[PDB]
């Protein structure tokens, strides 16, 4: 039943390519994994293209709860409902010493939240963190439940497939 077919999958999880709309569209998932920031601050990359999605209600019932007791770490993750569409806004880290460990915490906080996830890739836009890096910080913690992975660009899915073929 599913409208969009997953170019890969490895174990667990499935790997689609698609712009928000694709994916929202195409993909059968319980919420969408965004990308976000400390105050949610919607830019940006994939943070922006799920606003105009929404739009902008992601901005809204933002802050809303940003707002409300008032803002959110690395991460750690604040799940909104915008109509039948779940975003749980989950901070990467940004590159740097210590983005193993908050990598480690977000997969976490996505792999533990209820439902079957639709996930980017986090941190590998602008927080400059290698694509490969968060991909296999991705599967050592996401390693149970059925998790939907997205990546954009052809060059995305060729890094995917590749770090996926070494494996």
């Given at each position: 039943?599913?409208?969009l077919?997953?170019?890969?999958?490895?174990?667990?999880?499935?790997?689609?390519?698609?712009?928000?709309?694709t994916?929202?569209?195409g993909?059968?998932?319980?919420?969408?994994?965004?990308?976000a920031?400390?105050?949610?601050?919607?830019?940006?990359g994939?943070?922006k293209?799920?606003?105009?999605?929404?739009?902008?209600?992601?901005?809204?019932?933002?802050?809303?709860?940003?707002?409300?007791?008032?803002?959110?770490?690395?991460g750690?993750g604040?799940?909104?409902?915008c109509?039948?569409?779940?975003?749980f806004?989950?901070?990467?880290?940004?590159?740097?010493?210590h983005?193993?460990?908050?990598l480690?915490?977000?997969?976490?906080?996505?792999?533990?939240?209820?439902?079957?996830?639709?996930?980017?890739?986090?941190?590998?836009?602008?927080?400059?963190?290698k694509?490969?890096t968060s991909?296999?910080?991705?599967l050592?913690?996401?390693?149970?439940?059925?998790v939907?992975?997205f990546?954009?660009?052809?060059?995305?899915?060729?890094?995917?497939?590749?770090?996926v073929?070494?494996?």
């Amino acid at each position: 039943k599913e409208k969009l077919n997953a170019f890969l999958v490895h174990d667990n999880v499935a790997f689609y390519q698609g712009d928000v709309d694709t994916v929202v569209n195409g993909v059968d998932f319980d919420f969408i994994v965004n990308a976000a920031n400390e105050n949610l601050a919607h830019g940006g990359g994939l943070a922006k293209a799920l606003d105009v999605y929404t739009k902008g209600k992601l901005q809204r019932l933002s802050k809303e709860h940003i707002g409300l007791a008032g803002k959110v770490k690395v991460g750690t993750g604040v799940m909104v409902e915008c109509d039948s569409l779940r975003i749980f806004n989950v901070v990467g880290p940004r590159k740097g010493k210590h983005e193993r460990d908050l990598l480690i915490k977000a997969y976490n906080t996505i792999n533990n939240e209820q439902g079957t996830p639709l996930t980017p890739i986090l941190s590998c836009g602008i927080f400059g963190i290698k694509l490969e890096t968060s991909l296999e910080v991705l599967l050592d913690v996401c390693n149970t439940k059925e998790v939907k992975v997205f990546v954009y660009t052809d060059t995305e899915v060729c890094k995917v497939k590749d770090f996926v073929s070494g494996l």
